[PDB]
């Protein structure tokens, strides 16, 4: 339970750092079930509510 | 000649003269002596008038001269300075 708890938290973070056009928004919208750690209660369920809810200057100085 | 008058030019006349010479300088910004001397003049006339007052086109123009310094005969260093 806890092994996959930390695994799933790490994977949620990893997909979060993956900016996509089909990113974890689709995962989360169906991840209303379970996307965080769950061992028995407490910091488990709380975790749910924690996550369930020069050329550059040319870019920055010619069109910002 | 030109630097003195540009330093003492009336700011209002500066505006319409700038509007007149915008494209005339932009196009020309892009033996060997003729071009580099003309660009000498262009830099030394535009700088003083930028020193007066502040669209979007200008945002490009600056870098059109930035590389003009970063090249890797003394007229070349004078060009970089201008």
From Swiss-Prot, chain A:
Which residues does this entry mark as bearing N6-acetyllysine?
Answer: 9, 14
Of the intact sequence, the residues represented are 652 to 732 of 732
The record's subunit annotation is: Heterodimer composed of XRCC5/Ku80 and XRCC6/Ku70; heterodimerization stabilizes XRCC5 protein. Component of the core long-range non-homologous end joining (NHEJ) complex (also named DNA-PK complex) composed of PRKDC, LIG4, XRCC4, XRCC6/Ku70, XRCC5/Ku86 and NHEJ1/XLF. Additional component of the NHEJ complex includes PAXX. Following autophosphorylation, PRKDC dissociates from DNA, leading to formation of the short-range NHEJ complex, composed of LIG4, XRCC4, XRCC6/Ku70, XRCC5/Ku86 and NHEJ1/XLF. (Microbial infection) Interacts with human T-cell leukemia virus 1/HTLV-1 protein HBZ.
Location in the cell reads: Nucleus; Nucleus, Nucleolus; Chromosome
Q: Gene name on record?
A: XRCC5
What does the record say about domains?
Answer: The EEXXXDDL motif is required for the interaction with catalytic subunit PRKDC and its recruitment to sites of DNA damage. The VWFA domain interacts with the KBM (Ku-binding motif) found in a number of DNA repair proteins.
On induction, the UniProt comment says: In osteoblasts, by FGF2.
What else is on record for this protein?
Individuals with systemic lupus erythematosus (SLE) and related disorders produce extremely large amounts of autoantibodies to XRCC6 and XRCC5.
This chain belongs to the protein called X-ray repair cross-complementing protein 5
* Source domain of life: Eukaryota
The covalently linked position for Glycyl lysine isopeptide (Lys-Gly) (interchain with G-Cter in SUMO2), per the record, is 18, 37
Motif position, EEXXXDL motif: 54-60
Indicate the family of this protein.
Answer: Belongs to the ku80 family.
What does this gene product do? Single-stranded DNA-dependent ATP-dependent helicase that plays a key role in DNA non-homologous end joining (NHEJ) by recruiting DNA-PK to DNA. Required for double-strand break repair and V(D)J recombination. Also has a role in chromosome translocation. The DNA helicase II complex binds preferentially to fork-like ends of double-stranded DNA in a cell cycle-dependent manner. It works in the 3'-5' direction. During NHEJ, the XRCC5-XRRC6 dimer performs the recognition step: it recognizes and binds to the broken ends of the DNA and protects them from further resection.
Modified after translation how? ADP-ribosylated by PARP3. Phosphorylated on serine residues. Phosphorylation by PRKDC may enhance helicase activity.
From Swiss-Prot, chain B:
* PTM section of the record: Autophosphorylated at two clusters, the T2609 cluster and the S2056 cluster. Autophosphorylation induces a conformational change that leads to remodeling of the DNA-PK complex, requisite for efficient end processing and DNA repair. S-nitrosylated by GAPDH.
> Where does the record say this protein resides?
Nucleus; Nucleus, Nucleolus; Cytoplasm, Cytosol
Give the highest taxon in the source lineage.
Answer: Eukaryota
Q: How does it assemble?
A: DNA-PK is a heterotrimer of PRKDC and the Ku dimer (composed of XRCC6/Ku70 and XRCC5/Ku86). Formation of this complex may be promoted by interaction with ILF3. Component of the core long-range non-homologous end joining (NHEJ) complex (also named DNA-PK complex) composed of PRKDC, LIG4, XRCC4, XRCC6/Ku70, XRCC5/Ku86 and NHEJ1/XLF. Additional component of the NHEJ complex includes PAXX. Following autophosphorylation, PRKDC dissociates from DNA. Interacts with DNA-PKcs-interacting protein (KIP) with the region upstream the kinase domain.
The similarity annotation says: Belongs to the PI3/PI4-kinase family.
Which disease does the record tie it to? Immunodeficiency 26 with or without neurologic abnormalities: A form of severe combined immunodeficiency characterized by reduced or absent T and B cells, recurrent candidiasis, and lower respiratory tract infections. Some patients show dysmorphic features, severe growth failure, microcephaly, seizures, and impaired neurological functions.
Question: What is the recorded function of this protein according to its Swiss-Prot or TrEMBL entry?
Answer: Serine/threonine-protein kinase that acts as a molecular sensor for DNA damage. Involved in DNA non-homologous end joining (NHEJ) required for double-strand break (DSB) repair and V(D)J recombination. Must be bound to DNA to express its catalytic properties. Promotes processing of hairpin DNA structures in V(D)J recombination by activation of the hairpin endonuclease artemis (DCLRE1C). Recruited by XRCC5 and XRCC6 to DNA ends and is required to (1) protect and align broken ends of DNA, thereby preventing their degradation, (2) and sequester the DSB for repair by NHEJ.
The name this protein goes by in its record: DNA-dependent protein kinase catalytic subunit
> Which species is the source of this protein?
Homo sapiens
Gene (name only): PRKDC
């Amino acid at each position: 339970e806890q092994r996959f708890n930390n695994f799933l938290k790490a994977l949620q973070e990893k997909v979060e750092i993956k900016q996509l056009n089909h990113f974890w928004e689709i995962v989360v919208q169906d991840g209303i079930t379970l996307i965080t750690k769950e061992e028995a209660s407490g910091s488990s369920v709380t975790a749910e509510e924690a996550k369930k809810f020069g050329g550059d200057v040319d870019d920055l100085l010619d069109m910002i | 000649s030109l630097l003195t008058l540009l330093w003492h030019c009336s700011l209002d006349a500066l505006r319409e003269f700038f509007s007149t010479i915008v494209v005339d300088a932009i196009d020309v910004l892009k033996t060997f002596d003729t071009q580099i001397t003309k660009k000498m003049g262009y830099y030394k006339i535009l700088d003083v008038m930028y020193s007066r007052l502040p669209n979007e086109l200008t945002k490009t123009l600056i870098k059109l001269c930035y590389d003009a310094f970063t090249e890797n005969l003394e007229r070349r260093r004078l060009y970089h300075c201008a």
